[PDB]
């Protein structure tokens, strides 16, 4: 019905001038991040010490109040600087630079989307971010940098006037989704093309947003398999770039003819990074 | 501490009371498309009815709105269509030898009974097509009774009430069968826990993996490490990771049962076809 070749030509012809992107853990794993600790991993072994009832207990608030040490152990990993953004995050940085990006809805807390240079306005961190925090008592806002010292020292931030725990802005199990998520009402009808990068779509309202786009809008699924509402309810102009995520993005960049421009971006950003 | 050691324990009847927990892992070798995957299978067929989502087939309000999608699925999995695989008969052999204590299954295919395992030895935790209950009549009916209507793309109706006759399947939100509460008795008394091809995503099912006492070893032949086995392991845990059929086959050989196994699958395939 439609191919990645056809999509590249449309972008190249500026037919899709307002792009909404939906990314998940698929794009972070090429960067080495174990966003889920399920496999055997260094981050996995440490959290078993605390004897949590189950792996998702750290995201649940009541267990945290019992013992906040496991969550901050996780935070110590994901705090910016430890891991680097990969080609995917820079492909979306290129999408922004060209003036095409409308919004980037991400399921990740790694923060690599902002690290790669994408402004917060063009970005909806749908599960939160470690870039800010609020005292669990005074409900006072603090930037990420403020608590960086304490986190990296295996300590638990206490704030200045409260001396109460300073939790970063992470959406815990039961917490309402970020205010910025409600931009889906504005963004999705106006989008002219939907990109989905490495998202299982088994969790809603994320999955539900795939049907928000107009019937003219094509939907590009570069995930390793066809998943979510795309499989149950596909559209005619949909394109499934199934396979390894980096392979799909690289092919699409080649088909767009941006590899030359792409190499420059990865270089100058790697320099600033280290 | 290793797969052979478990086999030797069973082989010597040191593990005389085995509790087994199986999932859709052991059915897919039989050809059953239980998973309702995006590729060729029922998926496209149930899309005709324009479900809101694939799991909507097992909702009570939608089924009352439109019961045709569920019965479409039923026609497929209804007994006499698919055959049991090596796993299902390996557990039948375990029963015949007097070793099986109970078989807790997450599957609705029914191949466990087809393979010869009695209903008493079985806890079909998501339901079974061995019975039905009229949604209005509230009268129980045997499985075979509705086969004609189901297999003819029709919707069965109760004889006196003429109301829909829904198989005994546990729809999303309905309480698990009373038969599930045997877990209180079985698991403390169990002598060995066998886990074959279950994701352990469902937490009421998953929680039972830790129910056995710490003396009991737990054998996980599932492809990957999941559930409380992976998250919170014990010393006596054994993980025979890899393809399910091969893992069961290796255990059968390690038990010295390969000859008796080939005998069972052959003569049982004869009875069926």
């Amino acid at each position: 019905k439609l191919s990645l070749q056809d999509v590249a030509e449309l972008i190249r012809a500026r037919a899709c001038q307002r792009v909404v992107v939906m990314v998940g853990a698929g794009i972070s794993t090429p960067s080495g991040i174990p966003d889920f600790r399920s496999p055997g991993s260094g981050l996995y072994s440490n959290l078993q010490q605390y004897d949590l009832p189950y792996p998702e207990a750290i995201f649940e608030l009541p267990f945290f109040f019992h013992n906040p040490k496991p969550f901050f152990t996780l935070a110590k990993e994901l705090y910016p600087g430890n891991y680097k953004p990969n080609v995917t995050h820079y492909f979306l940085r290129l999408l922004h630079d060209k003036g095409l990006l409308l919004r980037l809805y991400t399921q990740n807390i790694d923060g690599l989307e902002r690290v790669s240079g994408i402004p917060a306005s063009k970005l909806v961190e749908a599960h939160g971010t470690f870039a800010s925090a609020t005292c669990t008592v005074c409900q006072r806002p603090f930037p990420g940098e403020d608590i960086r010292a304490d986190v990296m020292a295996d300590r638990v931030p206490r704030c200045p006037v409260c001396t109460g725990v300073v939790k970063p802005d992470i959406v815990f199990f039961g917490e309402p989704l970020p205010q910025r998520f409600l931009l889906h009402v504005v963004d999705f009808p106006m989008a002219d093309l939907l990109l989905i990068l490495g998202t299982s779509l088994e969790v809603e309202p994320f999955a539900s947003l795939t049907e928000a786009v107009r019937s003219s809008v094509p939907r590009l699924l570069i995930n390793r398999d066809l998943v979510g509402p795309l499989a149950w309810h596909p559209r005619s102009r949909d394109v499934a770039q199934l396979g390894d995520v980096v392979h799909g993005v690289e092919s699409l960049v080649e088909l767009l003819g941006w590899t030359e421009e792409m190499r420059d971006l990865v270089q100058r950003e790697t320099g600033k990074l280290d | 501490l290793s797969l052979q050691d478990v086999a030797e324990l069973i082989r010597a009847r040191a593990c005389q009371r085995v509790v087994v927990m199986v999932g859709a892992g052991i059915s897919t070798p039989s050809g059953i498309p239980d998973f309702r995957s995006p590729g060729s299978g029922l998926y496209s067929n149930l899309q005709q009815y324009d479900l809101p989502y694939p799991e909507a087939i097992f909702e009570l309000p939608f089924f009352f709105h439109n019961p045709k999608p569920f019965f479409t699925l039923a026609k497929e999995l209804y007994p006499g269509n698919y055959k049991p695989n090596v796993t299902h008969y390996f557990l039948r052999l375990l029963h015949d030898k007097g070793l099986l204590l109970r078989l807790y299954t997450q599957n609705i295919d029914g191949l466990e009974r087809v393979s010869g395992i009695p209903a008493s030895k079985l806890v079909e935790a998501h339901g079974t097509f061995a019975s039905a209950t009229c949604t209005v009549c509230q009268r129980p009916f045997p499985g075979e009774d509705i086969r004609a209507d189901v297999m003819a793309d029709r919707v069965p109706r109760c004889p006196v009430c003429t109301g829909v006759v829904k198989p005994d399947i546990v729809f999303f939100g309905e309480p698990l069968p009373q038969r599930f509460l045997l877990h209180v008795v079985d698991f403390p008394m169990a002598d060995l826990l066998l886990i074959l091809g279950t994701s352990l995503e469902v937490e009421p099912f998953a929680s039972l993996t830790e129910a056995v006492r710490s003396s009991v070893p737990r054998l996980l032949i599932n492809r990957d490490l999941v559930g409380p086995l992976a998250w919170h392991p014990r010393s006596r845990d054994v993980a025979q990771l890899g393809d399910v059929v091969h893992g069961v086959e290796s255990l059968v050989e390690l038990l010295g049962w390969t000859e008796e196994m080939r005998d069972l699958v052959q003569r049982e395939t004869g009875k069926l076809d």
Partner: peptide, 13 residues
Amino acid sequence: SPVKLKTFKXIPM
């Protein structure tokens, strides 16, 4: 109470 699709969800609102 079997396999309730919403096993664990971060509520949107």
